Design a protein around this ligand. Structure first.
Ligand code: FAD
Ligand code: FAD
Lengths: 306, 306
């Protein structure tokens, strides 16, 4: 029966920053963090490019600060997943298991999942040699031999950036055709630090504390080999977590939530969106934090208009 | 004779975050911080809504972290103002006194100045009762009697937000006409917590450690009075620091630098813009930091295309 001012869905930097602003604005935000709360930084180690930390901070340490900061101003945080939403109209409903909650405004901050290879070693060595983010982690592989997996613009983009650091980048793709644009594909072939390895997949990532090599398989002949490398960058795409809102909020062709102009307004009145659910360009904690603030200010001012 | 990869102009959150990203990307950024370096947070006390600090941090402490973080990754920081720029073409030039520096890309991060009343007490009590940012500081005035100065949408917006906290908001304006939109003006007159005081100006802000009152003058009759209040919010407009780039980069009618779509690209190739020089909506440190990251990623990827 209680209709809250605002419900926030998600607990990465965008969700917590939206919650900090909404709570400090006395909106008493109700935040569904998920059971895998804390966003993508919970799965990494050192975060060095989030401004405000001259010697860096671990991913979980930073997310713990954000969560405690949200609590300090009165956010109501629940470590539960939203299973369904009704976002159309003056009163929006979220369903969590068999419980329901309602609000005048909803901030969507569910993020985007990086796709994974699904091979042994990939998850255990994430943050210790395996990464999905060259902007985040490429700096840690100066003068090392690394691999990049994928066939699209993402892989070309990641592989290009990594050559700023690595001694060599071996770009592996499971076919001999590339989904990447002609411009992106042509540039990497010109980059002398990049070696292409087509018709190839990783079957296992080796290493007892850190990545020491990968096991390879030829997707056509089945020939197997080993490659000594100390880094693996997985760039086979992203899946924005928009499944909840498909059919109610306009998405682009790749599933990202569309927003109006430079604002966080979605196609639905009273519904705002932030973070990597929206941004398919930068995908950083600081940009997600910024947009979560913007969504909270948009929502507060929209609520004051009602 | 040396042409740098990138020059950054400004040292608020946008500039330092751009410098952190560019330095960590091995672009060896050259940053002109200004003689009044560190941006708007140098002039405030406690910053509580920048995510990552569960008990807050002072403005200067936070900016010191950002500056040291930029240095850690190799940024070249100079506490000097850029006096003129030549931004058109493949090689851009900045002039600093009688010295010149050149770069393939330029990130503009000069911020926006809040306009001040220019009366005794205003600067000394900034951060101790005087503020230009309701989103930043309104939380500190719960159940207090405060004033807001100004006649436009900014003053209506600030005064509206402040009623979430204050016991009373007295909106003071030097005329009996208002430059604010009919909708904004009509809503505040409906807000029972707002009292309008037209044809009135502040001549002095009183208080030996914190704001304790203001001296008033009637702009028509000259009648003077005293008003006991513990907060003064100045909302008489902003001046984006775009003077350097007027005539080379497209600006909107209020002087903000225009950017393309959701990117940081300006109207000039190789020139990107971040922070409150661009954003005339949110004006927070976290949003400025986010856009400074975005400008640095845009610039890095644009540089790789050349
Ligand atoms: C391994 C790794 C390392 C990284 N390192 C860095 C780095 O060093 N620097 C940097 O700036 N960036 C880094 N990033 C990127 C950064 O973490 C992300 O860009 C950022 O966290 C995006 O924030 P977000 O809030 O939009 O989404 P997310 O971080 O993805 O958080 C969304 C959260 O909401 C939850 N959620 C989703 N759906 C629901 C639902 N239905 N109900 C409830 N909760 C839900 C999710 O479980 C998740 O906890 C890294 C990413 C990865 C994967
Ligand atoms: C009193 C006050 C309190 C605030 N409190 C908060 C708060 O609690 N939380 C929050 O999130 N936000 C707060 N803000 C707002 C926040 O500080 C700004 O939104 C943010 O700093 C904008 O960052 P920026 O990089 O775009 O620009 P700025 O902060 O304005 O920094 C620009 C810098 O570049 C320099 N520069 C300009 N032109 C040149 C040039 N030609 N050459 C060289 N250098 C140049 C300037 O001198 C300045 O140092 C506050 C603002 C004020 C004024």
């Amino acid at each position: 029966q209680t209709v809250h001012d605002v419900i926030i869905i998600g607990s990465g930097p965008a969700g917590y920053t939206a919650a900090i602003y909404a709570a400090r604005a006395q909106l008493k935000p109700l935040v569904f963090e998920g059971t895998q709360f804390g966003g993508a930084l919970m799965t990494t180690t050192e975060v060095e490019n989030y401004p405000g930390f001259r010697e860096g901070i671990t991913g979980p340490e930073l997310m713990d600060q954000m969560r405690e900061q949200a609590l300090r101003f009165g956010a109501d945080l629940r470590m539960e997943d939203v299973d369904a939403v009704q976002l159309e109209g003056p009163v929006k409903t979220v369903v969590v298991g068999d419980e329901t909650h309602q609000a005048r405004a909803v901030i969507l901050a569910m993020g985007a999942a990086a796709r994974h290879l699904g091979v042994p070693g990939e998850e255990a060595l994430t943050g210790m040699g395996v990464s999905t983010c060259a902007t985040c982690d490429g700096f840690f592989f100066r003068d090392q031999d690394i691999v990049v997996v994928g066939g699209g613009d993402s892989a070309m983009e990641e592989a290009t950036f990594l050559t700023r650091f690595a001694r060599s980048v071996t770009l592996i793709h499971r076919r001999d055709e590339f989904r990447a644009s002609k411009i992106m594909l042509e540039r990497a072939r010109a980059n002398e630090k990049i070696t292409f390895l087509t018709n190839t997949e990783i079957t296992q990532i080796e290493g007892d504390p850190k990545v020491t090599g990968v096991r390879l398989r030829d997707t056509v002949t089945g020939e197997e080999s080993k490659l000594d490398v100390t880094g693996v960058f997985v760039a086979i795409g992203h899946d924005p977590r928009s499944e909840l809102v498909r059919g109610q909020v306009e998405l682009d062709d790749e599933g990202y939530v569309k927003v109006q102009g430079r604002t966080t307004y979605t196609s639905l009145d009273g519904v705002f969106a932030a973070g990597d659910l929206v941004d398919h360009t930068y995908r950083q904690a600081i940009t997600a934090a910024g947009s979560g603030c913007a969504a909270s200010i948009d929502a507060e001012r929209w609520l004051a208009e009602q």
